[PDB]
Scaffold this active site. Structure first.
Site, short mmCIF file in Angstrom:
data_model
loop_
_atom_site.label_atom_id
_atom_site.label_comp_id
_atom_site.label_asym_id
_atom_site.label_seq_id
_atom_site.Cartn_x
_atom_site.Cartn_y
_atom_site.Cartn_z
CG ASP A 80 -2.18 0.83 1.17
OD1 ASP A 80 -2.40 1.59 0.18
OD2 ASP A 80 -2.98 0.68 2.12
CG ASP A 106 -9.54 3.41 1.89
OD1 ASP A 106 -8.88 2.96 0.92
OD2 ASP A 106 -9.06 3.68 3.00
O1 LIG Z 1 -3.58 2.56 6.77
C1 LIG Z 1 -4.45 1.39 6.33
C2 LIG Z 1 -5.08 1.46 5.04
C3 LIG Z 1 -4.72 2.52 4.24
C4 LIG Z 1 -5.32 2.83 2.98
O2 LIG Z 1 -6.30 3.92 3.13
C5 LIG Z 1 -5.87 1.52 2.34
F1 LIG Z 1 -6.57 1.82 0.95
C6 LIG Z 1 -6.83 0.86 3.31
O3 LIG Z 1 -7.57 -0.27 2.66
C7 LIG Z 1 -5.99 0.45 4.58
O4 LIG Z 1 -5.31 -0.71 4.17
#
Ligand SMILES: OCC1=C[C@H](O)[C@H](F)[C@@H](O)[C@H]1O
Ligand SMILES: [Mg+2]
Length: 534
Positions: A336, A396
């Site tokens: 990520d 998200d």
């Molecule tokens: O910090 C955790 C996190 C950060 C991002 O917003 C990702 F897209 C969300 O799904 C989460 O894994």
């Protein structure tokens, strides 16, 4: 191939558009390029040497309504009015999620990788060296390849540009995406994982005690993967140091595997916080500005720096980290905030941020091996094709629809789903699309039954990845039935029939699903759907 008055009006590298083979020798660079016929359009390909800088490839009159695309997972893919555009105010804590070339986005409408209008797609097939983007400049659409002041002693390949025309805009976007897939040797797994993700119930407050509760309950759900999200780690960059009641990262993998799941784990592998052990030990491992660490973004109430993926020491560290995880038994990796690795700035080697990014993600792939699933998130899209198995393609989701949430990348089920629809064509071509997690609990949520159905069945029809994120003790008969019915909608070839929609109503068909030929018509304003199965 498209021929006409509008084609005569275009310019390619500053020259009137026409078929052929050409050379442009400028003061600071040379381009050799061909303009060639392909099915339903034209392809512009070639090679460049010197200092091309921000290189203009194509110029044409801007359409009134354009489908524009942000470079990374979370950013919008949406139809905008090109003539009434006003620059957004860019959040200094998140500037590089908005754009890798923020100087553009603060003046002009920007679209990354591709842009569409009714009946026409303009699209770059790769982002291996340059960042390919479009800008609307005083009523003209201009395609650029950004080389970030890097100089090339010998020729390197252009990112190829296609111009496709046909009244069937969805067909064009699919064709574009098939060309991208072939250009980059896309990974399209034959099997799509199901599973569980901690984030959208527990967020940073996950405990191991709650994790174990869910691990036991998960044996009653059709989950293959059991994935720990952000919470377990002591700091951003210190991935093998746990906090709170968590055992070791190795121990977590052993417990998960012992309970019969594929272990999954979240990391933000190109990110290191100002407080992390790794940054404090290795201050020279990050991208710089005027010789000092350059903030990549602010999150977790900390300055976050970007690893410099041009440095061998950094690549060796990444390799060792991900090799270690693989040895522990992790086989599903959610990686990520990957945009950090492509931030513009000073690196050890005079390579573009895109070249650096690709070295980093290739290293990760080598480390985890071919039988590990890599899910990209917060990621530049085109540079990741060929490396990731799945990719988050929207902002998200959330345990709420997001009535008062703007279309600005803040969590909201409504905007997450919009992007699963408008980027549908990447699915099974670039990678498996990840539309973000299904939230099917009936407590500790503001989603209605109808909203949960609308989200879930849409993701099923689109053949997308299906991951659930809930306290499983709060998922009862309705949630279990929705998941079951969702999985029956998988396996088809989807098409969003009205991709240029401006009213958040979409007609989606999918041929050859496990339920036969299906269609779902959705209205993201009224939160209604109509589903047909044959
Ligand atoms: O910090 C955790 C996190 C950060 C991002 O917003 C990702 F897209 C969300 O799904 C989460 O894994
Ligand atoms: Mg499929």
């Amino acid at each position: 191939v498209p021929r006409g008055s509008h084609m005569a009006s275009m310019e390619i590298f500053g020259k009137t558009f026409r078929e052929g083979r050409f050379v442009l020798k400028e003061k600071n660079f040379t381009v050799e390029f061909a303009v060639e016929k392909i099915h339903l359009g034209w392809k512009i390909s070639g090679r460049v040497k010197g200092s091309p800088g921000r290189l203009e490839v194509l110029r044409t009159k801007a359409p009134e309504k354009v489908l524009v695309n942000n470079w990374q997972s979370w950013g919008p893919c949406r139809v905008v009015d090109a003539f009434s555009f006003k620059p957004p105010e860019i959040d200094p804590n998140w500037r590089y999620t908005a754009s890798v070339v923020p100087d553009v986005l603060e003046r002009n409408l920007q679209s990354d990788y591709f842009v569409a209008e009714e009946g026409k797609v303009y699209g770059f097939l790769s982002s291996k060296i340059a960042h390919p983007f479009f800008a609307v400049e005083d009523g003209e659409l201009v395609a650029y390849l950004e080389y970030f002041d890097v100089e090339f002693d010998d020729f390197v390949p252009l990112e190829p540009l296609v111009v496709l025309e046909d009244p069937n805009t969805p067909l064009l976007l699919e064709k574009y995406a098939e060309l991208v897939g072939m250009e980059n040797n896309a990974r399209v797994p034959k099997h799509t994982p199901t599973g569980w993700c901690s984030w959208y119930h527990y967020f940073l407050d996950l405990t191991w005690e709650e994790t174990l509760k869910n691990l036991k309950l998960a044996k009653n759900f059709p989950f293959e993967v059991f994935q720990i999200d952000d919470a377990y780690e002591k700091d951003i960059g210190d991935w093998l140091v746990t906090r709170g009641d968590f055992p070791s990262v190795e121990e977590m993998a052993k417990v998960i595997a012992e309970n019969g799941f594929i272990p999954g784990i979240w990391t933000a592998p190109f990110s290191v916080s100002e407080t992390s052990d790794v940054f404090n030990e290795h201050p020279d491992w990050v991208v710089k500005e005027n010789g000092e660490p350059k903030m990549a973004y602010r999150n977790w109430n900390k300055k976050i720096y970007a690893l410099d993926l041009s440095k061998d020491e950094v690549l060796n560290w990444l390799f060792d980290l991900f090799s270690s995880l693989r040895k522990m038994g992790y086989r599903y990796f959610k990686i990520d905030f990957l945009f950090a690795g492509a931030v513009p700035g000073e690196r050890k080697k005079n390579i573009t941020p895109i070249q650096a990014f690709r070295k980093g993600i290739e290293t990760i792939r080598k480390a985890v091996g071919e039988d590990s699933f890599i899910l990209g998130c917060g990621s530049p899209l085109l540079p990741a094709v060929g490396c990731v198995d799945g990719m988050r393609i929207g902002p998200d989701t959330a345990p709420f629809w997001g009535e008062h949430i703007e279309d600005n990348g803040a969590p909201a089920a409504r905007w997450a789903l919009r992007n699963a629809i408008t980027r549908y064509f990447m699915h099974d071509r670039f990678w498996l699309n990840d539309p973000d997690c299904l939230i099917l609990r009936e407590e500790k949520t503001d989603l209605t039954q109808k909203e949960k159905e609308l989200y879930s069945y849409t993701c099923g029809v689109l053949d997308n990845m299906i991951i659930e994120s809930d306290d499983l003790s709060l998922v009862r008969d309705h949630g279990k039935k929705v998941l079951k019915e969702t999985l029956e909608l998988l396996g088809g070839r989807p098409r969003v029939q009205n991709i240029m929609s401006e009213d958040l109503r979409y007609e989606i068909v999918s041929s050859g699903t496990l339920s036969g030929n299906v269609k779902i018509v959705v209205d993201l304003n009224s939160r209604e759907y109509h589903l047909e199965k044959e």
